[PDB]
Scaffold this active site. Structure first.
Site, PDB file in Angstrom:
ATOM      1  N   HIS A  40       0.818  -1.183   0.000  1.00  0.00           N
ATOM      2  CA  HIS A  40       0.000   0.000   0.000  1.00  0.00           C
ATOM      3  C   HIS A  40       0.875   1.265   0.000  1.00  0.00           C
ATOM      4  O   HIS A  40       0.362   2.343  -0.212  1.00  0.00           O
ATOM      5  CB  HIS A  40      -1.022  -0.060   1.103  1.00  0.00           C
ATOM      6  CG  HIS A  40      -0.528   0.412   2.416  1.00  0.00           C
ATOM      7  ND1 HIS A  40      -0.141  -0.440   3.427  1.00  0.00           N
ATOM      8  CD2 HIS A  40      -0.426   1.673   2.916  1.00  0.00           C
ATOM      9  CE1 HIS A  40       0.185   0.279   4.492  1.00  0.00           C
ATOM     10  NE2 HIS A  40       0.050   1.562   4.193  1.00  0.00           N
ATOM     11  N   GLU A  52      19.360   7.081   7.662  1.00  0.00           N
ATOM     12  CA  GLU A  52      18.669   8.260   8.190  1.00  0.00           C
ATOM     13  C   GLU A  52      18.467   8.177   9.714  1.00  0.00           C
ATOM     14  O   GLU A  52      18.084   7.078  10.238  1.00  0.00           O
ATOM     15  CB  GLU A  52      17.293   8.420   7.577  1.00  0.00           C
ATOM     16  CG  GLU A  52      17.262   8.935   6.133  1.00  0.00           C
ATOM     17  CD  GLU A  52      17.609  10.412   6.057  1.00  0.00           C
ATOM     18  OE1 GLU A  52      18.116  10.994   7.075  1.00  0.00           O
ATOM     19  OE2 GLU A  52      17.353  11.008   4.992  1.00  0.00           O
ATOM     20  N   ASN A  54      17.467  11.879  11.727  1.00  0.00           N
ATOM     21  CA  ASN A  54      16.601  13.045  11.466  1.00  0.00           C
ATOM     22  C   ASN A  54      16.346  13.104   9.950  1.00  0.00           C
ATOM     23  O   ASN A  54      17.249  13.423   9.190  1.00  0.00           O
ATOM     24  CB  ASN A  54      17.270  14.322  11.941  1.00  0.00           C
ATOM     25  CG  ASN A  54      16.303  15.510  11.966  1.00  0.00           C
ATOM     26  OD1 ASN A  54      15.540  15.701  11.031  1.00  0.00           O
ATOM     27  ND2 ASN A  54      16.280  16.268  13.080  1.00  0.00           N
ATOM     28  N   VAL A  57      17.223  16.728   8.282  1.00  0.00           N
ATOM     29  CA  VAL A  57      18.590  17.274   8.423  1.00  0.00           C
ATOM     30  C   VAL A  57      19.613  16.279   7.812  1.00  0.00           C
ATOM     31  O   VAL A  57      19.557  15.129   8.090  1.00  0.00           O
ATOM     32  CB  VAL A  57      18.933  17.539   9.902  1.00  0.00           C
ATOM     33  CG1 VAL A  57      20.337  18.145  10.032  1.00  0.00           C
ATOM     34  CG2 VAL A  57      17.908  18.451  10.529  1.00  0.00           C
ATOM     35  N   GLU A  62      23.862   9.381   5.457  1.00  0.00           N
ATOM     36  CA  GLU A  62      22.805   9.008   4.553  1.00  0.00           C
ATOM     37  C   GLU A  62      23.306   8.497   3.188  1.00  0.00           C
ATOM     38  O   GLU A  62      24.338   8.945   2.679  1.00  0.00           O
ATOM     39  CB  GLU A  62      21.903  10.222   4.261  1.00  0.00           C
ATOM     40  CG  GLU A  62      21.168  10.786   5.489  1.00  0.00           C
ATOM     41  CD  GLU A  62      21.855  11.910   6.137  1.00  0.00           C
ATOM     42  OE1 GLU A  62      23.055  12.164   5.871  1.00  0.00           O
ATOM     43  OE2 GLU A  62      21.200  12.617   6.956  1.00  0.00           O
ATOM     44  N   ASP A 171       1.771   1.841  19.990  1.00  0.00           N
ATOM     45  CA  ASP A 171       1.400   1.304  18.675  1.00  0.00           C
ATOM     46  C   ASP A 171       2.195   1.982  17.556  1.00  0.00           C
ATOM     47  O   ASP A 171       2.812   3.063  17.765  1.00  0.00           O
ATOM     48  CB  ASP A 171      -0.099   1.621  18.435  1.00  0.00           C
ATOM     49  CG  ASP A 171      -0.829   0.689  17.403  1.00  0.00           C
ATOM     50  OD1 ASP A 171      -2.110   0.848  17.348  1.00  0.00           O
ATOM     51  OD2 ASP A 171      -0.210  -0.147  16.664  1.00  0.00           O
ATOM     52  N   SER A 172       2.116   1.376  16.370  1.00  0.00           N
ATOM     53  CA  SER A 172       2.504   2.075  15.125  1.00  0.00           C
ATOM     54  C   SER A 172       1.363   3.003  14.689  1.00  0.00           C
ATOM     55  O   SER A 172       0.228   2.908  15.219  1.00  0.00           O
ATOM     56  CB  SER A 172       2.846   1.073  14.032  1.00  0.00           C
ATOM     57  OG  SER A 172       1.760   0.211  13.762  1.00  0.00           O
ATOM     58  N   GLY A 175       2.315   6.886   8.633  1.00  0.00           N
ATOM     59  CA  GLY A 175       3.710   7.237   8.361  1.00  0.00           C
ATOM     60  C   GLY A 175       4.706   6.181   8.757  1.00  0.00           C
ATOM     61  O   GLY A 175       5.855   6.168   8.257  1.00  0.00           O
TER      62      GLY A 175
HETATM   63 CA   LIG Z   1      19.069  12.911   7.701  1.00  0.00          CA
HETATM   64 CL   LIG Z   2      -0.080   4.985   6.452  1.00  0.00          CL
END
Ligand SMILES: [Ca+2]
Ligand SMILES: [Cl-]
Ligand SMILES: [Cl-]
Ligand SMILES: [Cl-]
Length: 223
Positions: A40, A52, A54, A57, A62, A171-172, A175
């Site tokens: 999904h 990653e 932050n 920033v 990264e 929980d999750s 995002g």
């Molecule tokens: Ca970053």
């Molecule tokens: Cl979602």
């Protein structure tokens, strides 16, 4: 993640942010060339962001790599979220290091009660909206299939499990989708869906990765 804690920078080195101008889903690195996420989370033009902490920033560890191909599970049903899993191949291989590392696939399924680590940059409020800039973590057990099915009657398949706390609070959330549920060192879940976040008797629902290992390995080997 609601009711969690700040993981610490690069403490979850298999955790990826999927970016299409902005973070919209998590994912998990499974080898230098491949990421597993939720179906999904499918979009054209994904950039995978590894190493990653932050996400707003540039902190120096990264790697930003465009996806070359996305493969949604052949049996993915967007109405029910059954088979909520997709593979994403990277245009160039990730450079693996202590902050960018793959997570093992399971050789068998995990049992109820097993403690897992769930992580992501999703919303941290149960009844409001606040998105973190750094990665959040939650320790949560796999719930019994009966508790999972009671919570979501008519909606849970053998390709789903619940994890979390029936009392709510942890929980999750939006995002976090597509991100990892890791138990005893294996990727056992993908953040898939639920009813709200951190609500009583409504634990998070996760794609049951152990059902897909043959498909993942065959698909990667052929692509
Ligand atoms: Ca970053
Ligand atoms: Cl979602
Ligand atoms: Cl069955
Ligand atoms: Cl491969």
């Amino acid at each position: 993640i609601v009711g969690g804690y700040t993981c610490g920078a690069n403490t979850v080195p298999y955790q990826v942010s999927l970016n299409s101008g902005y973070h919209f889903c998590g994912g998990s690195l499974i080898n230098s060339q491949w990421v597993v996420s939720a179906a999904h989370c499918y979009k054209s033009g994904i950039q995978v962001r590894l190493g990653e902490d932050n996400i707003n920033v540039v902190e120096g560890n990264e790697q930003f790599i465009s996806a070359s191909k996305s493969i949604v599970h052949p049996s993915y049903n967007s109405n029910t979220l059954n088979n909520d899993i997709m593979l994403i191949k990277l245009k160039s291989a990730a450079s693996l290091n202590s902050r960018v590392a793959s997570i093992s696939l399971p050789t068998s399924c995990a049992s109820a009660g097993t403690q897992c680590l769930i992580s992501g940059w999703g919303n941290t409020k149960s009844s409001g909206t606040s998105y973190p800039d750094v990665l959040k973590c939650l320790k949560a057990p796999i719930l019994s299939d009966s508790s999972c099915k009671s919570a979501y009657p008519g909606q849970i398949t053998s390709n789903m499990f619940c994890a979390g706390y029936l009392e709510g609070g942890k929980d999750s959330c939006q995002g976090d989708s597509g991100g990892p549920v890791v138990c005893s060192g294996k990727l056992q879940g993908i953040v898939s869906w639920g009813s709200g976040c951190a609500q009583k008797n409504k634990p998070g629902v996760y794609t049951k990765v152990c059902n897909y290992v043959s498909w993942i390995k065959q698909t990667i080997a052929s692509n």
